[PDB]
């Protein structure tokens, strides 16, 4: 899959406004969502060349397991209660939900496992000046597991990977025109020695479109336009820009 | 909404401006009598005169102030789909209730 995207940010200050605005531009409400991502690297004990049985220069990369956490495993207070995601995010700022996230990695709270989104991405498309961030993603869905060691952690080890780092993200997304999505988000590093919000101070803004093609230059070029239109329409309110490629490279590093 | 107040403050400033006119109009006809040598109402001439100055200075502060306020308001921070979609039911449902039993 091809993910064309634009990024930016707002302090928690700007959120309230941005929201009211984004709802009008898109005509849909923001919808509350979250997801945990667990990153894995090749087992540093094993060691392998960078070539195939089909002499191909192939680089080691990280794997990313992603999925939803039902909010019941995430939220601090019922008193706050409510359905509203933005006023709720202030509640979440600076610091962690229950987490300790290890628990879920190996079941608990005699067990099989969930579905995951197993992904691996390449550095965004080399480009002298790109109007948009264009990134390739290889994905498969894991449906459930079976066998002796059926915990997701066992599975990853069986395949020769090792857990590297992880993070939770909670936000609202806007469903929009021609597959355009806008996520207003917050990210939290999850370690065993406690959790900290990566996005502390505000929200990561991501406007994107996943395209099935890649090899339909036309739909690719259409997609560029879509993103451009957005950045443009909001220009003078918020700049959507292309992130540094180097900063989106999940390789060995 | 409660801005309808600020709206009425300006619509009244508007009537203040139509007074700048109404007042200085007397200043016109009254200075008519005055240079005609008939010093008859010279005090009254002075009155409606500082009054045209007064009305426009009040208007001047009032709309200038209103502009300051709008800048301050500016500094301060489809809807169709939403309510309508649900509310469909609320009316037809309540009415279907009504034709089933009543009074």
């Amino acid at each position: 899959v091809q993910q064309l995207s634009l990024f930016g940010s707002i302090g928690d200050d700007g959120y309230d406004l941005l929201i009211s605005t984004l709802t009008t531009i898109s005509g849909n409400p923001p919808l509350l969502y979250n997801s945990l991502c667990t990153v894995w690297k090749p087992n540093p004990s094993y060691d392998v060349e960078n070539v195939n049985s089909r002499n191909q220069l192939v680089e080691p990369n990280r794997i990313k397991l992603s999925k939803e956490v039902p909010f019941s495993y995430l939220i601090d207070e019922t008193m706050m209660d409510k359905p509203l995601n933005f006023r709720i995010l202030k509640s979440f700022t600076n610091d962690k939900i229950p987490l300790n996230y290890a628990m879920t990695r190996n079941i608990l709270h005699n067990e099989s496992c969930s579905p995951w989104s197993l992904q691996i991405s390449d550095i965004p498309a080399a480009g002298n000046n790109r109007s948009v961030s264009m990134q390739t993603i290889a994905e498969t869905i894991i449906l459930s597991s079976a066998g002796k060691n059926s915990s997701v952690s066992s599975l990853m080890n069986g395949l020769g990977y090792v857990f590297e780092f992880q993070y939770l993200t909670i936000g609202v997304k806007f469903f929009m025109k021609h597959g355009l999505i806008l996520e207003l988000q917050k990210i939290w590093q999850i370690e065993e020695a406690g959790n900290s919000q990566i996005t502390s101070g505000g929200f990561l803004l991501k406007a994107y479109i996943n395209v099935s093609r890649g090899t339909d230059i036309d739909r690719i070029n259409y997609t560029e336009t879509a993103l451009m239109n957005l950045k443009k329409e909001l220009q003078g309110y918020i700049e959507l820009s292309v992130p540094d490629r180097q900063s989106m490279d999940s390789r060995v590093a | 909404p409660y801005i309808q107040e600020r709206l009425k403050s300006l619509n009244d400033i508007e009537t203040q401006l139509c007074s700048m006119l109404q007042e200085a109009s007397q200043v016109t006809f009254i200075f008519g009598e005055l240079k005609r040598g008939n010093e008859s109402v010279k005090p009254q001439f002075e009155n409606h005169v500082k009054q045209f100055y007064e009305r426009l200075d009040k208007s001047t502060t009032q709309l200038r102030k209103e502009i300051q306020l709008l800048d301050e308001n500016v500094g301060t921070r489809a809807l169709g789909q939403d309510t309508e979609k649900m509310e469909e039911q609320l009316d037809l449902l309540s009415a279907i209730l009504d034709p089933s039993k009543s009074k």
Partner: peptide, 22 residues
């Protein structure tokens, strides 16, 4: 009447998400 007239680094955030560089 007379008078006179960022919350953080976008790039680095992303850097983290991809490598765990913080």
């Amino acid at each position: 009447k007379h008078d006179f007239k960022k919350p953080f680094n976008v790039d680095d955030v992303l850097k983290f998400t991809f490598t765990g560089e913080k």
